[PDB]
Design a protein around this ligand. Structure first.
Ligand SMILES: [Zn+2]
Length: 183
């Protein structure tokens, strides 16, 4: 199983590289890591499991974060009363379309590869349409908005060598953009 020691930290050259496109079908090994990535997410969200292994709860993981420079991500956004949840292991994900309108998490964002809390607002597109392939090479189209759009943008950013704090305005780090929806 993947643990915290497998997670590389900010400073590692791999987190700043542009991850490589995957050929399809995936190799047996690429399928296993993606499954292991999703499983790490499932474990981290379980209070008991997370406590036994000391995992930080998270809803997204990108391959570069476990030192694998390939374009694959795992997104596991739980429900918590709404009836809307997301569980995806995607390959070669790309935002094909998106709004001009922004959205942001009021408390900013965190990242398993960044050990210290960085303050500031991360304005992302409020709505996005994504294209990707799943673990079997099947096509996936997803239309997302709000929090789920933000999670996916954070993960895709990792494939391009972008960190959440790259989006923080250094002069006015905490000023919300006009017409940006708070999530
Ligand atoms: Zn992150």
């Amino acid at each position: 199983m993947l643990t915290m020691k497998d997670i590389i930290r900010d400073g590692h050259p791999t987190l700043r590289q542009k991850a490589a496109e995957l050929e399809l079908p995936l190799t047996k090994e690429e399928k296993e890591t993606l499954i292991a990535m999703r499983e790490f997410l499932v474990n981290s969200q379980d209070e008991e499991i997370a406590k036994r292994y000391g995992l930080r709860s998270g809803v997204g993981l990108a391959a570069p974060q476990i030192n694998i420079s390939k374009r694959m991500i795992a997104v596991l956004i739980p429900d918590d009363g709404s009836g809307k949840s997301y569980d995806y292991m995607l390959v070669n994900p790309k935002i094909v379309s998106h709004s001009v309108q922004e959205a942001y998490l009021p408390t900013g964002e965190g990242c398993l590869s960044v050990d210290d809390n960085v303050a500031g607002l991360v304005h992302r597109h409020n709505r996005i349409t994504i294209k990707a392939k799943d673990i079997e090479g099947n096509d996936i189209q997803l239309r997302l908005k709000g929090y789920p759009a933000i999670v996916f943008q954070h993960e895709i950013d990792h494939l391009n060598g972008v960190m959440f704090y790259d989006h923080i305005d250094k002069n006015h780090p905490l000023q919300p953009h006009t017409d940006a929806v708070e999530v």
